[PDB]
Design a protein around this nucleic acid. Structure first.
Length: 95
RNA sequence: GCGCGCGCGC
RNA sequence: GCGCGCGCGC
């Protein structure tokens, strides 16, 4: 499954996104939305970034049971999009 | 190796 | 805070 998407996963996606941000001298911000009531809260994270290489912006919107997971999934979608658009290489590290 | 910073885990 | 792994710069 990650095999279809350049071996980008929840555990390596944020690092690779931040490295893209650094190389491009941009900064993306996670925008969070509360889901469920206060005693059963989970999160939407979303982010929009302009990609110089493509001349267009991309977007991700993901749910997680906590803020950390919501942000990791958001970065995962973003990074997998960049992979399939050829902006970003397949993951080369270890698994 | 230093400066700035990031990831995963505990 | 600690461990391991990285990035940009010099």
């Amino acid at each position: 499954n990650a095999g279809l998407h350049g071996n980008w996963t929840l555990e390596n996606a944020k690092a690779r996104l931040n490295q893209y941000f650094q190389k491009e001298k941009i900064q993306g911000e996670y925008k969070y939305t509360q889901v469920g009531p206060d005693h059963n809260r989970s999160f939407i994270a979303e982010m929009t970034i302009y990609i110089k290489q493509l001349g267009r912006r991309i977007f991700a919107r993901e749910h997680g049971s906590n803020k950390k997971l919501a942000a990791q999934s958001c970065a995962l979608s973003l990074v997998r999009q960049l992979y399939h658009l050829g902006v970003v290489e397949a993951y080369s590290g270890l698994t």
